[PDB]
Symmetry: C4
Subunit: 95 residues, 4 copies
């Protein structure tokens, strides 16, 4: 379950690195903005302060969303159930 | 389970084709933009770089979201559990 | 299960009517735009072509999201599992 | 189950207070706007009427989304199943 978490964590980082490199290069974003946009996209927040302007970028974004959402949300779920929840429970019981 | 996936895949493509034809025609979008907007809508990202301007388009969008989200997210789930997950597990074991 | 669906359907309509009346009145939207915005909000798409400008509207929106998401998505789930899925299965078997 | 709800409720309030203080201070938003933006972010609506402009804000937002979504949506789920659903059922049976 901690190895579950480690693998999803690594996969999430790799997925976000892919987006960061793509949007920096093809859409011309600063790397921090490309990382931020990748996160805002795959968590489905979608502010629209950044959005792709090239056709190559729009096509990549379609594919990135379909591949990336299941991973990101799997990580979020394991984070909440396997890390946040036990730490909250631990806080209720003084030692 | 691979036939589960094939059917959801076909249904997702058909749903995205419907949106592409509608928004190209009624909202005047280029086809690639109409496909991109359909994806951004049904995955609930919603950048707002494109949004419907006609009343016909707003009404269609209401109905398209309610019909389209359950399908799209069903496909994403099967993609992640039935295709991505086994391929990740396979990568852990050299042959 | 069809009464499950009927109740969620009615509750969803009532929730969308509430939003339509509120945003028309307080935020000055045309009724069709207020309905569209309510749907775009509770399904978490969030284009931002419309957004509340008054403090009363922002406060209402906070509460409307928290009360409305669980209902809307419950309806979507029952729609997909209890109506769309059987009709798809029925299409596979000629009579 | 009512203590389940109380704990998630308190945690959600604390998470929203954190965002309110951060975005007011670092991004210069009025407190009501910072609360509204925090809610719009963690429920994944993402209108984009407000979005972070500083790099410190973008980095905080990445981390806030990953930590905050699992909590917020856990609260929404318990709200819908443990509070809204029983009250709806109660309304069906006159006393
Ligand atoms: K969104
Ligand atoms: K969303
Ligand atoms: K969601
Ligand atoms: K926007
Ligand atoms: K959005
Ligand atoms: K937006």
């Amino acid at each position: 379950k901690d190895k579950e978490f480690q693998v999803l964590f690594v996969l999430t980082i790799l997925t976000l690195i892919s987006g960061t490199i793509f949007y920096s290069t093809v859409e011309g974003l600063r790397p921090i903005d490309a990382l931020y946009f990748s996160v805002v996209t795959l968590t489905t927040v979608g502010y629209g302060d950044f959005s792709p302007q090239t056709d190559f970028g729009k096509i990549f974004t379609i594919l990135y969303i379909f591949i990336g959402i299941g991973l990101v949300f799997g990580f979020i779920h394991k984070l909440a159930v396997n890390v946040q929840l036990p730490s909250i429970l631990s806080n209720l019981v003084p030692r």
